[PDB]
Amino acid sequence: ELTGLDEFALLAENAEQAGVNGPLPEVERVQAGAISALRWGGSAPRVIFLHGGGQNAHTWDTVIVGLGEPALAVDLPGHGHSAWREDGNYSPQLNSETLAPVLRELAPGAEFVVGMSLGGLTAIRLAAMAPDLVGELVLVDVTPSALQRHAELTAEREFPSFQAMLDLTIAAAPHRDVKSLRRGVFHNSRRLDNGNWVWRYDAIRTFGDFAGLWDDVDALSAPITLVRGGSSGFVTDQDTAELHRRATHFRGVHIVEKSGHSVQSDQPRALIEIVRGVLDT
């Protein structure tokens, strides 16, 4: 299997995963350097989606299809089709600084932001440095403290075959449907000329200053709602109460059963329902 394959070849699998029938939504990869994004059915968008570390904007495909709504899914810097830095800084503070121009242009009227991990926190930042852009906010299995805990704990390249990247991520999660895993890896890697394959994402040398972030939370007037992986230990009861404590309008936690950290990968049907309810109807 050789892959001169369009990045949207597998949309139908996404539609099936979402349990939605009917015609697929309009889509194009869009850019304002230094950023790439996929704009959806638009003539839009009502919602912005920010992915997590190691991921790219394709993790939201099934969620976005499942959801009726026009939207902007962004490749954070260091990720997918967005520029790397090699100062290694894809901190939420940096990420927001550069996205803010881009979201003014593309998706000027987006009511909502949905961020998982790295994207959730950069969305926090974006909400503080640009309240006009962030009407309401949705965090996917992340708290400023919860990611710092992760950063601390994990403070510590060319592949002969696509299959070898596949096996590697099979090892990460053997219990998962290969067809899905293959999809995610497809959108997350590319072939060189050598024949050899490589990850589209950069390795992260730096997360941000997590305390200014909390001052941003204190400062945020946008309502936050949190979504947790029922089987994810990433975010704790303590982390949650704290979020509630510091937050101006905390709308609560939805805890999704049988989902890990990446809720959009694990139980997108449920994430769809949660997000749907957040659009006030």
CSV table of C-alpha atoms in Angstrom, one decimal:
chain,number,residue,atom,x,y,z
A,1,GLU,CA,0.0,0.0,0.0
A,2,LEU,CA,1.4,3.3,-1.3
A,3,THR,CA,-0.2,6.5,-0.3
A,4,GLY,CA,-0.9,9.2,-2.8
A,5,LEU,CA,-4.0,9.3,-0.7
A,6,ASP,CA,-6.1,12.4,-0.2
A,7,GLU,CA,-6.3,13.5,3.4
A,8,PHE,CA,-10.0,13.2,3.2
A,9,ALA,CA,-10.2,9.8,1.7
A,10,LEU,CA,-11.3,8.3,5.1
A,11,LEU,CA,-14.1,10.7,6.0
A,12,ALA,CA,-16.7,8.0,5.6
A,13,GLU,CA,-15.0,5.9,8.4
A,14,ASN,CA,-15.3,9.0,10.5
A,15,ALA,CA,-19.0,9.4,9.7
A,16,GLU,CA,-19.6,5.8,10.7
A,17,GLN,CA,-17.8,6.2,13.9
A,18,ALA,CA,-20.0,9.2,14.8
A,19,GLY,CA,-23.1,7.1,13.9
A,20,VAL,CA,-24.3,9.8,11.5
A,21,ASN,CA,-25.7,9.1,8.1
A,22,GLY,CA,-26.1,11.2,5.0
A,23,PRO,CA,-23.8,13.5,3.1
A,24,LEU,CA,-20.4,14.6,4.2
A,25,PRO,CA,-19.6,18.2,5.0
A,26,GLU,CA,-17.7,20.6,2.9
A,27,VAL,CA,-14.0,20.9,3.9
A,28,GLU,CA,-10.7,22.5,2.9
A,29,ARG,CA,-7.2,22.8,4.5
A,30,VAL,CA,-6.8,26.5,5.0
A,31,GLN,CA,-3.7,28.6,6.0
A,32,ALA,CA,-2.5,31.9,7.2
A,33,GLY,CA,1.1,31.3,7.8
A,34,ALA,CA,2.3,30.2,10.2
A,35,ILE,CA,-0.8,28.2,10.7
A,36,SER,CA,-2.8,25.5,9.0
A,37,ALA,CA,-6.3,24.6,9.8
A,38,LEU,CA,-9.2,22.6,8.3
A,39,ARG,CA,-12.3,24.7,7.8
A,40,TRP,CA,-15.6,22.9,7.9
A,41,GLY,CA,-18.7,23.4,5.7
A,42,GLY,CA,-17.9,27.1,5.8
A,43,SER,CA,-19.5,29.5,5.0
A,44,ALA,CA,-19.0,29.2,8.8
A,45,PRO,CA,-17.7,28.8,11.6
A,46,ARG,CA,-19.5,28.5,15.0
A,47,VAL,CA,-16.8,26.5,16.9
A,48,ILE,CA,-13.0,26.4,17.2
A,49,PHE,CA,-11.3,23.1,18.1
A,50,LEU,CA,-7.8,22.9,19.6
A,51,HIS,CA,-6.1,19.5,19.7
A,52,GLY,CA,-3.6,18.1,22.3
A,53,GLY,CA,0.2,17.4,22.2
A,54,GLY,CA,1.3,14.7,19.7
A,55,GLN,CA,-2.0,15.1,17.9
A,56,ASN,CA,-3.2,17.2,14.9
A,57,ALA,CA,-6.4,18.8,13.8
A,58,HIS,CA,-7.7,15.5,12.4
A,59,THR,CA,-8.6,14.1,15.9
A,60,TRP,CA,-11.8,16.1,15.7
A,61,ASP,CA,-12.9,14.7,12.4
A,62,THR,CA,-15.5,12.3,13.8
A,63,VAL,CA,-16.6,14.9,16.4
A,64,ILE,CA,-17.0,17.6,13.8
A,65,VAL,CA,-18.9,15.3,11.4
A,66,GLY,CA,-21.1,13.9,14.1
A,67,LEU,CA,-21.9,17.5,15.1
A,68,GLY,CA,-24.1,19.4,12.7
A,69,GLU,CA,-22.0,22.5,12.9
A,70,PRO,CA,-19.5,24.5,10.7
A,71,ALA,CA,-16.1,24.9,12.4
A,72,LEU,CA,-12.4,25.6,12.5
A,73,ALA,CA,-10.1,22.8,13.6
A,74,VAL,CA,-6.6,24.2,14.0
A,75,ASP,CA,-3.2,22.5,13.7
A,76,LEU,CA,-1.3,24.1,16.6
A,77,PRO,CA,2.4,25.1,15.8
A,78,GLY,CA,4.7,22.1,15.9
A,79,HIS,CA,1.8,20.0,14.7
A,80,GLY,CA,0.2,18.6,11.6
A,81,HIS,CA,0.6,21.2,8.8
A,82,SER,CA,1.7,24.0,11.0
A,83,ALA,CA,5.2,25.5,11.2
A,84,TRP,CA,7.7,24.2,13.7
A,85,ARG,CA,10.0,26.6,15.6
A,86,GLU,CA,13.0,24.7,16.9
A,87,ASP,CA,13.1,27.0,19.9
A,88,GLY,CA,10.8,24.1,21.0
A,89,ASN,CA,8.2,26.4,22.4
A,90,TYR,CA,4.6,25.3,21.8
A,91,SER,CA,3.5,26.5,25.2
A,92,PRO,CA,-0.2,27.6,25.5
A,93,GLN,CA,1.1,31.2,26.1
A,94,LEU,CA,3.1,31.1,22.8
A,95,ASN,CA,0.4,29.2,20.9
A,96,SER,CA,-2.2,31.9,21.8
A,97,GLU,CA,0.1,34.7,20.8
A,98,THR,CA,0.3,33.5,17.2
A,99,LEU,CA,-3.2,31.9,16.7
A,100,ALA,CA,-4.9,35.2,17.7
A,101,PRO,CA,-4.1,36.9,14.4
A,102,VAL,CA,-5.2,33.8,12.5
A,103,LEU,CA,-8.6,33.3,14.3
A,104,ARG,CA,-9.5,37.0,13.7
A,105,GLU,CA,-9.2,36.2,10.0
A,106,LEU,CA,-10.4,32.6,9.8
A,107,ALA,CA,-13.4,32.0,12.0
A,108,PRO,CA,-13.9,35.7,13.1
A,109,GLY,CA,-17.3,34.9,14.7
A,110,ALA,CA,-16.7,31.5,16.5
A,111,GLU,CA,-18.9,31.4,19.5
A,112,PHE,CA,-17.1,28.5,21.2
A,113,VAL,CA,-13.6,27.0,21.7
A,114,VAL,CA,-13.0,23.3,22.4
A,115,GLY,CA,-9.5,22.4,23.6
A,116,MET,CA,-8.0,19.1,24.7
A,117,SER,CA,-4.7,19.1,26.7
A,118,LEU,CA,-2.3,21.5,25.1
A,119,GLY,CA,-5.1,23.1,23.1
A,120,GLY,CA,-7.4,23.5,26.2
A,121,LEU,CA,-4.8,25.5,28.0
A,122,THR,CA,-3.9,27.6,25.0
A,123,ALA,CA,-7.6,28.3,24.7
A,124,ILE,CA,-7.5,29.5,28.4
A,125,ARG,CA,-4.8,31.9,27.4
A,126,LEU,CA,-6.7,32.9,24.2
A,127,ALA,CA,-9.7,33.7,26.4
A,128,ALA,CA,-7.8,36.1,28.6
A,129,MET,CA,-5.7,37.9,25.9
A,130,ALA,CA,-8.8,38.1,23.5
A,131,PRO,CA,-12.1,37.9,25.4
A,132,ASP,CA,-14.0,39.0,22.2
A,133,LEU,CA,-13.0,35.7,20.4
A,134,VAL,CA,-14.0,33.3,23.2
A,135,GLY,CA,-17.7,33.4,24.0
A,136,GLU,CA,-17.7,30.1,25.8
A,137,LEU,CA,-15.1,27.5,26.6
A,138,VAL,CA,-14.9,23.6,26.7
A,139,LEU,CA,-11.9,21.8,28.3
A,140,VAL,CA,-11.3,18.2,27.3
A,141,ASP,CA,-9.5,16.2,30.1
A,142,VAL,CA,-7.2,19.1,31.2
A,143,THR,CA,-6.6,21.6,34.1
A,144,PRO,CA,-3.6,23.9,34.3
A,145,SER,CA,-2.4,21.9,37.3
A,146,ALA,CA,-3.2,18.6,35.6
A,147,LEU,CA,-0.9,19.4,32.7
A,148,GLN,CA,1.8,20.8,34.8
A,149,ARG,CA,1.8,17.5,36.7
A,150,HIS,CA,2.2,15.7,33.4
A,151,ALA,CA,5.0,18.1,32.3
A,152,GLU,CA,7.0,17.5,35.5
A,153,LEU,CA,6.5,13.6,35.3
A,154,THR,CA,7.7,13.4,31.6
A,155,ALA,CA,10.5,16.0,31.6
A,156,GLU,CA,12.5,12.7,30.7
A,157,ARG,CA,12.8,9.3,14.4
A,158,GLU,CA,13.0,8.0,10.8
A,159,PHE,CA,10.9,4.9,9.9
A,160,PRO,CA,11.4,2.3,7.2
A,161,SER,CA,7.7,1.6,6.7
A,162,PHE,CA,4.4,3.1,7.5
A,163,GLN,CA,3.6,-0.2,9.3
A,164,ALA,CA,6.4,0.5,11.8
A,165,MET,CA,4.8,3.8,12.9
A,166,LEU,CA,1.6,1.8,13.1
A,167,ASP,CA,3.1,-0.9,15.3
A,168,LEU,CA,4.7,1.6,17.6
A,169,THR,CA,1.3,3.2,18.2
A,170,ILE,CA,-0.3,-0.2,18.5
A,171,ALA,CA,2.1,-0.8,21.4
A,172,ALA,CA,0.9,2.5,23.0
A,173,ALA,CA,-2.7,1.1,23.0
A,174,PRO,CA,-3.0,-2.5,21.7
A,175,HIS,CA,-6.7,-2.7,22.8
A,176,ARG,CA,-7.8,-0.2,20.2
A,177,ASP,CA,-9.4,-0.8,16.7
A,178,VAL,CA,-6.6,-0.9,14.1
A,179,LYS,CA,-8.7,0.8,11.4
A,180,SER,CA,-9.0,3.8,13.7
A,181,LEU,CA,-5.4,3.7,14.8
A,182,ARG,CA,-4.3,3.4,11.2
A,183,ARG,CA,-6.4,6.5,10.4
A,184,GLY,CA,-5.0,8.6,13.2
A,185,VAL,CA,-1.4,7.6,12.2
A,186,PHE,CA,-2.2,8.4,8.6
A,187,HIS,CA,-3.1,12.0,9.4
A,188,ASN,CA,-0.2,12.2,11.8
A,189,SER,CA,2.7,11.1,9.6
A,190,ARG,CA,4.1,11.7,6.0
A,191,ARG,CA,6.3,9.9,3.5
A,192,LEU,CA,9.7,11.6,2.5
A,193,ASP,CA,11.4,10.9,-0.8
A,194,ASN,CA,13.7,8.3,0.8
A,195,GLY,CA,10.7,6.1,1.1
A,196,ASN,CA,11.2,6.6,4.9
A,197,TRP,CA,8.3,8.0,7.1
A,198,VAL,CA,8.2,10.6,9.9
A,199,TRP,CA,5.9,12.1,12.5
A,200,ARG,CA,4.2,15.4,11.5
A,201,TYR,CA,4.5,16.7,15.1
A,202,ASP,CA,7.5,18.2,16.8
A,203,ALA,CA,8.7,16.9,20.2
A,204,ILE,CA,7.9,19.4,22.9
A,205,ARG,CA,10.9,20.8,24.8
A,206,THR,CA,8.9,23.4,26.6
A,207,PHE,CA,5.5,23.9,28.1
A,208,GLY,CA,4.6,27.4,29.6
A,209,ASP,CA,4.7,29.2,32.9
A,210,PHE,CA,1.6,27.5,34.5
A,211,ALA,CA,1.0,30.2,37.2
A,212,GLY,CA,0.2,33.2,34.8
A,213,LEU,CA,-2.2,30.8,33.3
A,214,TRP,CA,-4.1,30.6,36.6
A,215,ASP,CA,-4.2,34.4,36.8
A,216,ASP,CA,-5.7,34.2,33.3
A,217,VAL,CA,-8.3,31.8,34.8
A,218,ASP,CA,-9.1,34.2,37.6
A,219,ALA,CA,-9.3,36.9,34.9
A,220,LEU,CA,-11.5,35.0,32.4
A,221,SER,CA,-15.1,35.9,32.3
A,222,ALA,CA,-16.0,33.2,29.7
A,223,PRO,CA,-17.9,30.2,31.2
A,224,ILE,CA,-15.8,27.0,31.4
A,225,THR,CA,-17.1,23.4,31.2
A,226,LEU,CA,-14.9,20.4,31.6
A,227,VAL,CA,-15.1,17.0,30.1
A,228,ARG,CA,-13.2,14.1,31.6
A,229,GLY,CA,-12.1,10.7,30.6
A,230,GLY,CA,-13.9,8.4,33.1
A,231,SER,CA,-10.9,6.0,32.6
A,232,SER,CA,-8.4,8.8,32.6
A,233,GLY,CA,-6.2,9.6,35.6
A,234,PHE,CA,-4.8,12.7,33.9
A,235,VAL,CA,-7.2,15.0,35.9
A,236,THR,CA,-8.2,14.5,39.5
A,237,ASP,CA,-11.1,15.4,41.8
A,238,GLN,CA,-8.7,17.9,43.5
A,239,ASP,CA,-7.8,19.4,40.1
A,240,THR,CA,-11.4,19.8,39.3
A,241,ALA,CA,-12.5,21.5,42.6
A,242,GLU,CA,-9.6,23.8,42.1
A,243,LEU,CA,-10.7,24.8,38.7
A,244,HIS,CA,-14.2,25.4,40.1
A,245,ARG,CA,-12.8,27.5,42.9
A,246,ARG,CA,-10.7,29.8,40.7
A,247,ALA,CA,-13.2,30.0,37.9
A,248,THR,CA,-15.7,32.8,37.5
A,249,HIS,CA,-18.5,30.6,35.7
A,250,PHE,CA,-17.8,26.9,36.0
A,251,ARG,CA,-20.6,25.0,34.4
A,252,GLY,CA,-19.4,21.6,35.7
A,253,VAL,CA,-17.6,18.3,34.8
A,254,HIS,CA,-19.1,15.7,32.4
A,255,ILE,CA,-17.3,12.4,33.2
A,256,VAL,CA,-17.4,10.1,30.2
A,257,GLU,CA,-17.3,6.4,31.0
A,258,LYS,CA,-14.8,4.0,29.2
A,259,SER,CA,-12.8,6.9,27.8
A,260,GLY,CA,-9.1,7.7,28.3
A,261,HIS,CA,-7.3,11.0,28.0
A,262,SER,CA,-8.2,11.6,24.3
A,263,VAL,CA,-11.9,11.7,24.7
A,264,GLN,CA,-12.5,12.6,21.1
A,265,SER,CA,-10.7,9.5,20.0
A,266,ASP,CA,-12.3,7.2,22.6
A,267,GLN,CA,-16.0,8.3,23.0
A,268,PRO,CA,-16.6,11.0,20.4
A,269,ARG,CA,-20.3,10.1,20.3
A,270,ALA,CA,-20.6,11.3,23.8
A,271,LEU,CA,-18.4,14.3,23.3
A,272,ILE,CA,-20.7,15.2,20.5
A,273,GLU,CA,-23.7,15.1,22.9
A,274,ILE,CA,-21.9,17.2,25.4
A,275,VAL,CA,-20.8,19.8,22.9
A,276,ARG,CA,-24.3,19.9,21.3
A,277,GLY,CA,-25.8,20.7,24.7
A,278,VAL,CA,-23.3,23.5,25.2
A,279,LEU,CA,-24.6,25.2,22.0
A,280,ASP,CA,-27.6,26.1,24.2
A,281,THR,CA,-29.6,23.6,22.2
